[PDB]
Design a protein around this ligand. Sequence first.
Ligand code: 55E
Length: 274
Amino acid sequence: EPLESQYQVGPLLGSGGFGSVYSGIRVSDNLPVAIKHVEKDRISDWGELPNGTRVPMEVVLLKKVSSGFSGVIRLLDWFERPDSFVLILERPEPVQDLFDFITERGALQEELARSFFWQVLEAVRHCHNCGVLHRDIKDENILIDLNRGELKLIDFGSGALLKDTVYTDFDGTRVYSPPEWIRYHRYHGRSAAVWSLGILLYDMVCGDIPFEHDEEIIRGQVFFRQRVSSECQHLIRWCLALRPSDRPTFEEIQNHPWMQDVLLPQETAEIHLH
Ligand SMILES: Cc1cc(C2=NC(=O)N=C(c3ccccc3)C2)ccc1O
């Protein structure tokens, strides 16, 4: 009931702008959890709980996306403390961050990249159905459940409620930010999400990001360092259309020729992860 009696705390999993995440175990059912600490001092994204109380946007957003669809990590609980917020999140076991998976394996085979991409497409589509906008889609914010071959979207610390009017604030990662942001500091949610999705696909199949500097983004020319299929190249260059309204919708991305005949997660695991 207190807090540190209900969860067997463990070793640091990582830390950065999101805060400090620790491996953990819920005492009782021995459920594997992740305990995320973030201090009020450095919280930039604040939100309002359904019942008034002021709270880290992440709590607001995870609450809006909690249920049976396991494409986004589940918030199991949360606590306020005098100077910080603590979040209890699910923890697949074994697990691996997409960034580390790609770092140690290089460019992914298209079949595997297809399976993964599809899964993050289903998970962003879910977030949007719940009025949630992630704003920081990238390899680091995606976990892999190595047993099931299921991806989980994580880290909603830069998200926002989904809206159809313009955004004038951006907290997410720069090299993942669309030409609209760089040039005008204005963007719309869906089309910006699609841009970052295009960066993600490229990263998956090439092993690295397509653009390093602002001028590279504004130019939007995509050079391919590795061998990549023609359909995949066309989907990538589409998501990375300079004009936002030129970018495909989620339905359009999922109906794209490259996106056909996706493996189910468990097949993915047996052929590519086991
Ligand atoms: C294993 C696990 C990790 C996380 C992370 N949450 C986060 O906000 N940020 C994370 C992160 C850590 C290091 C590098 C990049 C992201 C990880 C949430 C639930 C989990 O079960």
